[PDB]
Amino acid sequence: AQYEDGKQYTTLEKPVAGAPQVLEFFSFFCPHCYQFEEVLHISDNVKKKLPEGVKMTKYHVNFMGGDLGKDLTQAWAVAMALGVEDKVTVPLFEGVQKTQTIRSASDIRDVFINAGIKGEEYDAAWNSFVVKSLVAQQEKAAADVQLRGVPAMFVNGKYQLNPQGMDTSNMDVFVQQYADTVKYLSEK
């Protein structure tokens, strides 16, 4: 077949009931994630090919970068609660991997301030139970799939993308193969 289990994707032994349709995991410490966001724009090209009625979810993980890793998962909860993902993703990636100006929670906070979220608004979010539950959701979803590596994408809680088995000679071709694979899996 043209799409083979074990080739462009793998099947979960232990399928995850009720999971989001397209579920993506990343870390601001993760170098392929930087690439996926800044150079390849994976999330975006997947969206552009997904059917109608299919929502896309993206979660941060704790297992990279120790304490800062966890702060970042809480900051991403804040970003999701306020709907400001599109305004903080690039500066968080660049602050962590390019400029190395993010070394503490206060430095994470600065990124939001500079992006125009009000201090007051950020700190209230940071400390809110709605954000605590959003952190729990991120952790649970990673836990439900035994996640030890990022970037990762799961379709309908049963299929996991396998980019290792795709040509990387041309970046554009890679992205389309990736998005086309998500679409195929979505229709499965």
mmCIF file of the C-alpha atoms, coordinates in Angstrom:
data_MODEL
# 
_entry.id   MODEL 
# 
loop_
_atom_site.group_PDB 
_atom_site.id 
_atom_site.type_symbol 
_atom_site.label_atom_id 
_atom_site.label_alt_id 
_atom_site.label_comp_id 
_atom_site.label_asym_id 
_atom_site.label_entity_id 
_atom_site.label_seq_id 
_atom_site.pdbx_PDB_ins_code 
_atom_site.Cartn_x 
_atom_site.Cartn_y 
_atom_site.Cartn_z 
_atom_site.occupancy 
_atom_site.B_iso_or_equiv 
_atom_site.pdbx_formal_charge 
_atom_site.auth_seq_id 
_atom_site.auth_comp_id 
_atom_site.auth_asym_id 
_atom_site.auth_atom_id 
_atom_site.pdbx_PDB_model_num 
ATOM 1   C CA . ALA A 1 1   ? 0.000   0.000  0.000  1.00 0.00 ? 1   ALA A CA 1 
ATOM 2   C CA . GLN A 1 2   ? 1.201   3.574  -0.274 1.00 0.00 ? 2   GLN A CA 1 
ATOM 3   C CA . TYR A 1 3   ? 0.597   4.384  3.373  1.00 0.00 ? 3   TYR A CA 1 
ATOM 4   C CA . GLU A 1 4   ? 1.960   1.561  5.539  1.00 0.00 ? 4   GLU A CA 1 
ATOM 5   C CA . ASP A 1 5   ? 1.756   1.105  9.267  1.00 0.00 ? 5   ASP A CA 1 
ATOM 6   C CA . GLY A 1 6   ? 5.325   1.234  10.467 1.00 0.00 ? 6   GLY A CA 1 
ATOM 7   C CA . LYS A 1 7   ? 6.221   3.551  7.602  1.00 0.00 ? 7   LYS A CA 1 
ATOM 8   C CA . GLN A 1 8   ? 4.682   7.077  7.629  1.00 0.00 ? 8   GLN A CA 1 
ATOM 9   C CA . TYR A 1 9   ? 2.952   6.291  10.887 1.00 0.00 ? 9   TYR A CA 1 
ATOM 10  C CA . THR A 1 10  ? 2.682   3.723  13.682 1.00 0.00 ? 10  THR A CA 1 
ATOM 11  C CA . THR A 1 11  ? -0.413  2.398  15.424 1.00 0.00 ? 11  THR A CA 1 
ATOM 12  C CA . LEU A 1 12  ? -0.858  2.678  19.161 1.00 0.00 ? 12  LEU A CA 1 
ATOM 13  C CA . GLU A 1 13  ? -1.027  -0.664 20.953 1.00 0.00 ? 13  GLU A CA 1 
ATOM 14  C CA . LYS A 1 14  ? -3.229  1.047  23.478 1.00 0.00 ? 14  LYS A CA 1 
ATOM 15  C CA . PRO A 1 15  ? -5.637  3.404  21.684 1.00 0.00 ? 15  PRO A CA 1 
ATOM 16  C CA . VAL A 1 16  ? -6.689  6.497  23.601 1.00 0.00 ? 16  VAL A CA 1 
ATOM 17  C CA . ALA A 1 17  ? -10.453 6.905  23.813 1.00 0.00 ? 17  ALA A CA 1 
ATOM 18  C CA . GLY A 1 18  ? -11.891 10.416 23.628 1.00 0.00 ? 18  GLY A CA 1 
ATOM 19  C CA . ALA A 1 19  ? -8.560  11.907 22.563 1.00 0.00 ? 19  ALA A CA 1 
ATOM 20  C CA . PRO A 1 20  ? -8.484  15.096 20.448 1.00 0.00 ? 20  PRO A CA 1 
ATOM 21  C CA . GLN A 1 21  ? -8.666  14.654 16.679 1.00 0.00 ? 21  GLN A CA 1 
ATOM 22  C CA . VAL A 1 22  ? -5.233  16.055 15.833 1.00 0.00 ? 22  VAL A CA 1 
ATOM 23  C CA . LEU A 1 23  ? -3.040  16.205 18.920 1.00 0.00 ? 23  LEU A CA 1 
ATOM 24  C CA . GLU A 1 24  ? 0.457   17.701 18.698 1.00 0.00 ? 24  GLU A CA 1 
ATOM 25  C CA . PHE A 1 25  ? 3.175   17.662 21.437 1.00 0.00 ? 25  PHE A CA 1 
ATOM 26  C CA . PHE A 1 26  ? 6.210   19.926 21.681 1.00 0.00 ? 26  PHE A CA 1 
ATOM 27  C CA . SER A 1 27  ? 8.797   21.584 23.968 1.00 0.00 ? 27  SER A CA 1 
ATOM 28  C CA . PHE A 1 28  ? 10.354  25.040 23.594 1.00 0.00 ? 28  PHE A CA 1 
ATOM 29  C CA . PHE A 1 29  ? 13.634  23.157 24.371 1.00 0.00 ? 29  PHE A CA 1 
ATOM 30  C CA . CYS A 1 30  ? 13.182  20.754 21.440 1.00 0.00 ? 30  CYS A CA 1 
ATOM 31  C CA . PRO A 1 31  ? 15.290  21.500 18.368 1.00 0.00 ? 31  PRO A CA 1 
ATOM 32  C CA . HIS A 1 32  ? 13.101  19.691 15.794 1.00 0.00 ? 32  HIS A CA 1 
ATOM 33  C CA . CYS A 1 33  ? 10.145  21.527 17.314 1.00 0.00 ? 33  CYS A CA 1 
ATOM 34  C CA . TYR A 1 34  ? 11.848  24.844 16.545 1.00 0.00 ? 34  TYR A CA 1 
ATOM 35  C CA . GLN A 1 35  ? 12.246  23.688 12.966 1.00 0.00 ? 35  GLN A CA 1 
ATOM 36  C CA . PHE A 1 36  ? 8.610   22.403 12.846 1.00 0.00 ? 36  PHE A CA 1 
ATOM 37  C CA . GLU A 1 37  ? 7.435   25.812 13.951 1.00 0.00 ? 37  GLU A CA 1 
ATOM 38  C CA . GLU A 1 38  ? 9.831   28.310 12.374 1.00 0.00 ? 38  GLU A CA 1 
ATOM 39  C CA . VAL A 1 39  ? 11.072  26.639 9.181  1.00 0.00 ? 39  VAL A CA 1 
ATOM 40  C CA . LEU A 1 40  ? 8.487   24.006 8.219  1.00 0.00 ? 40  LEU A CA 1 
ATOM 41  C CA . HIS A 1 41  ? 5.306   25.499 9.692  1.00 0.00 ? 41  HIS A CA 1 
ATOM 42  C CA . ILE A 1 42  ? 3.923   21.970 10.179 1.00 0.00 ? 42  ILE A CA 1 
ATOM 43  C CA . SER A 1 43  ? 0.867   22.871 12.252 1.00 0.00 ? 43  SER A CA 1 
ATOM 44  C CA . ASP A 1 44  ? -0.174  25.383 9.698  1.00 0.00 ? 44  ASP A CA 1 
ATOM 45  C CA . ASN A 1 45  ? 0.214   23.169 6.639  1.00 0.00 ? 45  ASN A CA 1 
ATOM 46  C CA . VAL A 1 46  ? -1.618  20.341 8.378  1.00 0.00 ? 46  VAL A CA 1 
ATOM 47  C CA . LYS A 1 47  ? -4.495  22.706 9.120  1.00 0.00 ? 47  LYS A CA 1 
ATOM 48  C CA . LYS A 1 48  ? -4.591  23.827 5.478  1.00 0.00 ? 48  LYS A CA 1 
ATOM 49  C CA . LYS A 1 49  ? -5.253  20.249 4.357  1.00 0.00 ? 49  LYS A CA 1 
ATOM 50  C CA . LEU A 1 50  ? -7.505  19.009 7.155  1.00 0.00 ? 50  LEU A CA 1 
ATOM 51  C CA . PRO A 1 51  ? -11.213 18.455 6.396  1.00 0.00 ? 51  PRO A CA 1 
ATOM 52  C CA . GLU A 1 52  ? -14.008 20.528 7.837  1.00 0.00 ? 52  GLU A CA 1 
ATOM 53  C CA . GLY A 1 53  ? -15.057 19.821 11.424 1.00 0.00 ? 53  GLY A CA 1 
ATOM 54  C CA . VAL A 1 54  ? -11.604 18.811 12.657 1.00 0.00 ? 54  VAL A CA 1 
ATOM 55  C CA . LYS A 1 55  ? -10.014 20.733 15.526 1.00 0.00 ? 55  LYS A CA 1 
ATOM 56  C CA . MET A 1 56  ? -6.294  20.881 16.246 1.00 0.00 ? 56  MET A CA 1 
ATOM 57  C CA . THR A 1 57  ? -4.739  20.716 19.698 1.00 0.00 ? 57  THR A CA 1 
ATOM 58  C CA . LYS A 1 58  ? -1.143  21.543 20.711 1.00 0.00 ? 58  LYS A CA 1 
ATOM 59  C CA . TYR A 1 59  ? 0.399   20.798 24.114 1.00 0.00 ? 59  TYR A CA 1 
ATOM 60  C CA . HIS A 1 60  ? 3.734   21.480 25.821 1.00 0.00 ? 60  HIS A CA 1 
ATOM 61  C CA . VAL A 1 61  ? 5.613   18.776 27.733 1.00 0.00 ? 61  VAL A CA 1 
ATOM 62  C CA . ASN A 1 62  ? 7.607   18.689 30.971 1.00 0.00 ? 62  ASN A CA 1 
ATOM 63  C CA . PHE A 1 63  ? 10.327  16.168 30.250 1.00 0.00 ? 63  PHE A CA 1 
ATOM 64  C CA . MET A 1 64  ? 12.819  18.614 28.708 1.00 0.00 ? 64  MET A CA 1 
ATOM 65  C CA . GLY A 1 65  ? 14.593  21.435 30.482 1.00 0.00 ? 65  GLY A CA 1 
ATOM 66  C CA . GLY A 1 66  ? 13.809  20.583 34.085 1.00 0.00 ? 66  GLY A CA 1 
ATOM 67  C CA . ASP A 1 67  ? 12.290  23.360 36.142 1.00 0.00 ? 67  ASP A CA 1 
ATOM 68  C CA . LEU A 1 68  ? 12.149  25.748 33.211 1.00 0.00 ? 68  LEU A CA 1 
ATOM 69  C CA . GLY A 1 69  ? 10.432  23.001 31.256 1.00 0.00 ? 69  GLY A CA 1 
ATOM 70  C CA . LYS A 1 70  ? 7.584   22.941 33.729 1.00 0.00 ? 70  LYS A CA 1 
ATOM 71  C CA . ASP A 1 71  ? 7.339   26.741 33.836 1.00 0.00 ? 71  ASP A CA 1 
ATOM 72  C CA . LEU A 1 72  ? 7.012   26.621 30.095 1.00 0.00 ? 72  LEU A CA 1 
ATOM 73  C CA . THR A 1 73  ? 4.179   24.070 30.268 1.00 0.00 ? 73  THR A CA 1 
ATOM 74  C CA . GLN A 1 74  ? 2.415   26.428 32.706 1.00 0.00 ? 74  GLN A CA 1 
ATOM 75  C CA . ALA A 1 75  ? 3.165   29.420 30.410 1.00 0.00 ? 75  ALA A CA 1 
ATOM 76  C CA . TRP A 1 76  ? 1.692   27.542 27.490 1.00 0.00 ? 76  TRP A CA 1 
ATOM 77  C CA . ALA A 1 77  ? -1.432  26.920 29.606 1.00 0.00 ? 77  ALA A CA 1 
ATOM 78  C CA . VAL A 1 78  ? -1.534  30.734 30.081 1.00 0.00 ? 78  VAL A CA 1 
ATOM 79  C CA . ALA A 1 79  ? -1.111  31.270 26.341 1.00 0.00 ? 79  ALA A CA 1 
ATOM 80  C CA . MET A 1 80  ? -4.015  28.830 25.643 1.00 0.00 ? 80  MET A CA 1 
ATOM 81  C CA . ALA A 1 81  ? -6.287  30.382 28.273 1.00 0.00 ? 81  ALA A CA 1 
ATOM 82  C CA . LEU A 1 82  ? -5.756  33.918 26.837 1.00 0.00 ? 82  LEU A CA 1 
ATOM 83  C CA . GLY A 1 83  ? -5.709  32.805 23.200 1.00 0.00 ? 83  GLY A CA 1 
ATOM 84  C CA . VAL A 1 84  ? -2.311  34.356 22.580 1.00 0.00 ? 84  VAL A CA 1 
ATOM 85  C CA . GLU A 1 85  ? -0.445  31.330 21.232 1.00 0.00 ? 85  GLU A CA 1 
ATOM 86  C CA . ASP A 1 86  ? 0.260   33.007 17.898 1.00 0.00 ? 86  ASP A CA 1 
ATOM 87  C CA . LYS A 1 87  ? 1.957   35.929 19.637 1.00 0.00 ? 87  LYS A CA 1 
ATOM 88  C CA . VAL A 1 88  ? 4.289   34.101 22.016 1.00 0.00 ? 88  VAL A CA 1 
ATOM 89  C CA . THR A 1 89  ? 5.361   30.942 20.194 1.00 0.00 ? 89  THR A CA 1 
ATOM 90  C CA . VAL A 1 90  ? 8.153   32.435 18.129 1.00 0.00 ? 90  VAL A CA 1 
ATOM 91  C CA . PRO A 1 91  ? 9.660   34.630 20.916 1.00 0.00 ? 91  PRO A CA 1 
ATOM 92  C CA . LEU A 1 92  ? 9.534   31.742 23.353 1.00 0.00 ? 92  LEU A CA 1 
ATOM 93  C CA . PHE A 1 93  ? 11.335  29.424 20.918 1.00 0.00 ? 93  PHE A CA 1 
ATOM 94  C CA . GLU A 1 94  ? 13.893  32.112 20.079 1.00 0.00 ? 94  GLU A CA 1 
ATOM 95  C CA . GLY A 1 95  ? 14.408  33.147 23.698 1.00 0.00 ? 95  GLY A CA 1 
ATOM 96  C CA . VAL A 1 96  ? 15.107  29.531 24.661 1.00 0.00 ? 96  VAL A CA 1 
ATOM 97  C CA . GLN A 1 97  ? 17.129  28.205 21.675 1.00 0.00 ? 97  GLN A CA 1 
ATOM 98  C CA . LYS A 1 98  ? 18.435  31.239 19.715 1.00 0.00 ? 98  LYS A CA 1 
ATOM 99  C CA . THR A 1 99  ? 19.183  34.152 22.036 1.00 0.00 ? 99  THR A CA 1 
ATOM 100 C CA . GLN A 1 100 ? 19.208  32.286 25.359 1.00 0.00 ? 100 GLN A CA 1 
ATOM 101 C CA . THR A 1 101 ? 17.544  35.138 27.114 1.00 0.00 ? 101 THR A CA 1 
ATOM 102 C CA . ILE A 1 102 ? 15.025  32.870 28.813 1.00 0.00 ? 102 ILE A CA 1 
ATOM 103 C CA . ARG A 1 103 ? 16.449  31.504 32.045 1.00 0.00 ? 103 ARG A CA 1 
ATOM 104 C CA . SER A 1 104 ? 13.635  31.947 34.561 1.00 0.00 ? 104 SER A CA 1 
ATOM 105 C CA . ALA A 1 105 ? 9.871   32.288 34.885 1.00 0.00 ? 105 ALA A CA 1 
ATOM 106 C CA . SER A 1 106 ? 10.313  36.080 34.988 1.00 0.00 ? 106 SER A CA 1 
ATOM 107 C CA . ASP A 1 107 ? 12.037  35.897 31.609 1.00 0.00 ? 107 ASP A CA 1 
ATOM 108 C CA . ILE A 1 108 ? 9.140   33.839 30.245 1.00 0.00 ? 108 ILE A CA 1 
ATOM 109 C CA . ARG A 1 109 ? 6.773   36.490 31.613 1.00 0.00 ? 109 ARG A CA 1 
ATOM 110 C CA . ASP A 1 110 ? 8.763   39.284 29.833 1.00 0.00 ? 110 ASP A CA 1 
ATOM 111 C CA . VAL A 1 111 ? 8.007   37.644 26.468 1.00 0.00 ? 111 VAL A CA 1 
ATOM 112 C CA . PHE A 1 112 ? 4.277   37.923 27.126 1.00 0.00 ? 112 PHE A CA 1 
ATOM 113 C CA . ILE A 1 113 ? 4.628   41.562 28.346 1.00 0.00 ? 113 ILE A CA 1 
ATOM 114 C CA . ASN A 1 114 ? 6.557   42.529 25.239 1.00 0.00 ? 114 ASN A CA 1 
ATOM 115 C CA . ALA A 1 115 ? 3.925   40.764 23.157 1.00 0.00 ? 115 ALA A CA 1 
ATOM 116 C CA . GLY A 1 116 ? 1.305   43.015 24.767 1.00 0.00 ? 116 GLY A CA 1 
ATOM 117 C CA . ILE A 1 117 ? -0.369  40.922 27.431 1.00 0.00 ? 117 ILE A CA 1 
ATOM 118 C CA . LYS A 1 118 ? -0.837  43.061 30.528 1.00 0.00 ? 118 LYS A CA 1 
ATOM 119 C CA . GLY A 1 119 ? 1.211   42.137 33.586 1.00 0.00 ? 119 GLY A CA 1 
ATOM 120 C CA . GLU A 1 120 ? -1.854  42.058 35.752 1.00 0.00 ? 120 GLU A CA 1 
ATOM 121 C CA . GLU A 1 121 ? -3.621  39.843 33.195 1.00 0.00 ? 121 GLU A CA 1 
ATOM 122 C CA . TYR A 1 122 ? -0.691  37.434 32.902 1.00 0.00 ? 122 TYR A CA 1 
ATOM 123 C CA . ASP A 1 123 ? -0.073  36.985 36.616 1.00 0.00 ? 123 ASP A CA 1 
ATOM 124 C CA . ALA A 1 124 ? -3.786  36.414 37.295 1.00 0.00 ? 124 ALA A CA 1 
ATOM 125 C CA . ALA A 1 125 ? -3.844  33.780 34.546 1.00 0.00 ? 125 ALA A CA 1 
ATOM 126 C CA . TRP A 1 126 ? -0.541  32.226 35.780 1.00 0.00 ? 126 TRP A CA 1 
ATOM 127 C CA . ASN A 1 127 ? -2.042  31.753 39.226 1.00 0.00 ? 127 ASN A CA 1 
ATOM 128 C CA . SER A 1 128 ? -5.561  30.708 38.191 1.00 0.00 ? 128 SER A CA 1 
ATOM 129 C CA . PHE A 1 129 ? -7.194  27.276 38.631 1.00 0.00 ? 129 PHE A CA 1 
ATOM 130 C CA . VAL A 1 130 ? -8.342  27.381 35.017 1.00 0.00 ? 130 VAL A CA 1 
ATOM 131 C CA . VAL A 1 131 ? -4.634  27.343 34.134 1.00 0.00 ? 131 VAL A CA 1 
ATOM 132 C CA . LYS A 1 132 ? -3.948  24.629 36.736 1.00 0.00 ? 132 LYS A CA 1 
ATOM 133 C CA . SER A 1 133 ? -6.562  22.428 35.015 1.00 0.00 ? 133 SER A CA 1 
ATOM 134 C CA . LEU A 1 134 ? -5.072  23.280 31.573 1.00 0.00 ? 134 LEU A CA 1 
ATOM 135 C CA . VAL A 1 135 ? -1.663  22.115 32.908 1.00 0.00 ? 135 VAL A CA 1 
ATOM 136 C CA . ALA A 1 136 ? -3.333  18.860 34.085 1.00 0.00 ? 136 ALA A CA 1 
ATOM 137 C CA . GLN A 1 137 ? -4.869  18.381 30.624 1.00 0.00 ? 137 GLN A CA 1 
ATOM 138 C CA . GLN A 1 138 ? -1.434  18.727 28.974 1.00 0.00 ? 138 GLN A CA 1 
ATOM 139 C CA . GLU A 1 139 ? 0.144   16.278 31.394 1.00 0.00 ? 139 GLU A CA 1 
ATOM 140 C CA . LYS A 1 140 ? -2.665  13.737 31.144 1.00 0.00 ? 140 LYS A CA 1 
ATOM 141 C CA . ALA A 1 141 ? -2.651  13.705 27.334 1.00 0.00 ? 141 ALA A CA 1 
ATOM 142 C CA . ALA A 1 142 ? 1.111   13.072 27.264 1.00 0.00 ? 142 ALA A CA 1 
ATOM 143 C CA . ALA A 1 143 ? 0.659   10.403 29.943 1.00 0.00 ? 143 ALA A CA 1 
ATOM 144 C CA . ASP A 1 144 ? -2.127  8.664  27.989 1.00 0.00 ? 144 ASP A CA 1 
ATOM 145 C CA . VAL A 1 145 ? 0.304   7.919  25.133 1.00 0.00 ? 145 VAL A CA 1 
ATOM 146 C CA . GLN A 1 146 ? 3.518   7.084  26.989 1.00 0.00 ? 146 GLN A CA 1 
ATOM 147 C CA . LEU A 1 147 ? 5.196   10.124 25.459 1.00 0.00 ? 147 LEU A CA 1 
ATOM 148 C CA . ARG A 1 148 ? 9.005   10.259 25.706 1.00 0.00 ? 148 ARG A CA 1 
ATOM 149 C CA . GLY A 1 149 ? 9.803   12.171 22.539 1.00 0.00 ? 149 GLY A CA 1 
ATOM 150 C CA . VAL A 1 150 ? 8.865   15.348 20.728 1.00 0.00 ? 150 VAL A CA 1 
ATOM 151 C CA . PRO A 1 151 ? 7.819   16.608 18.241 1.00 0.00 ? 151 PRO A CA 1 
ATOM 152 C CA . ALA A 1 152 ? 4.855   14.181 18.207 1.00 0.00 ? 152 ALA A CA 1 
ATOM 153 C CA . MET A 1 153 ? 1.511   14.124 16.470 1.00 0.00 ? 153 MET A CA 1 
ATOM 154 C CA . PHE A 1 154 ? -1.321  11.689 17.165 1.00 0.00 ? 154 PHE A CA 1 
ATOM 155 C CA . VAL A 1 155 ? -4.478  11.300 15.081 1.00 0.00 ? 155 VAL A CA 1 
ATOM 156 C CA . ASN A 1 156 ? -7.754  10.357 16.853 1.00 0.00 ? 156 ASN A CA 1 
ATOM 157 C CA . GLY A 1 157 ? -5.852  8.830  19.749 1.00 0.00 ? 157 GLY A CA 1 
ATOM 158 C CA . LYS A 1 158 ? -4.751  5.871  17.647 1.00 0.00 ? 158 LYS A CA 1 
ATOM 159 C CA . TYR A 1 159 ? -2.162  6.854  15.028 1.00 0.00 ? 159 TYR A CA 1 
ATOM 160 C CA . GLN A 1 160 ? 1.233   8.466  15.553 1.00 0.00 ? 160 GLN A CA 1 
ATOM 161 C CA . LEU A 1 161 ? 3.088   10.300 12.771 1.00 0.00 ? 161 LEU A CA 1 
ATOM 162 C CA . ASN A 1 162 ? 6.467   8.859  11.799 1.00 0.00 ? 162 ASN A CA 1 
ATOM 163 C CA . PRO A 1 163 ? 8.578   11.566 10.150 1.00 0.00 ? 163 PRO A CA 1 
ATOM 164 C CA . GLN A 1 164 ? 11.729  9.390  10.259 1.00 0.00 ? 164 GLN A CA 1 
ATOM 165 C CA . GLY A 1 165 ? 10.143  7.453  7.391  1.00 0.00 ? 165 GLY A CA 1 
ATOM 166 C CA . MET A 1 166 ? 9.724   10.439 4.997  1.00 0.00 ? 166 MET A CA 1 
ATOM 167 C CA . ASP A 1 167 ? 12.204  12.042 2.531  1.00 0.00 ? 167 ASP A CA 1 
ATOM 168 C CA . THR A 1 168 ? 14.059  15.048 4.009  1.00 0.00 ? 168 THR A CA 1 
ATOM 169 C CA . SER A 1 169 ? 15.978  16.128 0.907  1.00 0.00 ? 169 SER A CA 1 
ATOM 170 C CA . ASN A 1 170 ? 13.450  18.852 0.117  1.00 0.00 ? 170 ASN A CA 1 
ATOM 171 C CA . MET A 1 171 ? 11.745  20.640 3.020  1.00 0.00 ? 171 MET A CA 1 
ATOM 172 C CA . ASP A 1 172 ? 8.575   21.455 1.101  1.00 0.00 ? 172 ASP A CA 1 
ATOM 173 C CA . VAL A 1 173 ? 8.088   17.906 -0.071 1.00 0.00 ? 173 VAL A CA 1 
ATOM 174 C CA . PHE A 1 174 ? 8.566   16.691 3.512  1.00 0.00 ? 174 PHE A CA 1 
ATOM 175 C CA . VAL A 1 175 ? 5.908   19.028 4.851  1.00 0.00 ? 175 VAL A CA 1 
ATOM 176 C CA . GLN A 1 176 ? 3.320   18.038 2.222  1.00 0.00 ? 176 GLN A CA 1 
ATOM 177 C CA . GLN A 1 177 ? 3.974   14.341 2.795  1.00 0.00 ? 177 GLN A CA 1 
ATOM 178 C CA . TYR A 1 178 ? 3.501   14.964 6.483  1.00 0.00 ? 178 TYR A CA 1 
ATOM 179 C CA . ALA A 1 179 ? 0.258   16.930 6.027  1.00 0.00 ? 179 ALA A CA 1 
ATOM 180 C CA . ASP A 1 180 ? -1.065  14.449 3.421  1.00 0.00 ? 180 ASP A CA 1 
ATOM 181 C CA . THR A 1 181 ? -0.352  11.662 5.883  1.00 0.00 ? 181 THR A CA 1 
ATOM 182 C CA . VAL A 1 182 ? -2.343  13.393 8.629  1.00 0.00 ? 182 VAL A CA 1 
ATOM 183 C CA . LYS A 1 183 ? -5.225  13.831 6.145  1.00 0.00 ? 183 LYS A CA 1 
ATOM 184 C CA . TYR A 1 184 ? -5.130  10.148 5.152  1.00 0.00 ? 184 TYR A CA 1 
ATOM 185 C CA . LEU A 1 185 ? -5.120  9.116  8.831  1.00 0.00 ? 185 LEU A CA 1 
ATOM 186 C CA . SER A 1 186 ? -7.931  11.551 9.567  1.00 0.00 ? 186 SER A CA 1 
ATOM 187 C CA . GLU A 1 187 ? -10.148 9.857  6.959  1.00 0.00 ? 187 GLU A CA 1 
ATOM 188 C CA . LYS A 1 188 ? -9.221  6.366  8.148  1.00 0.00 ? 188 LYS A CA 1 
# 
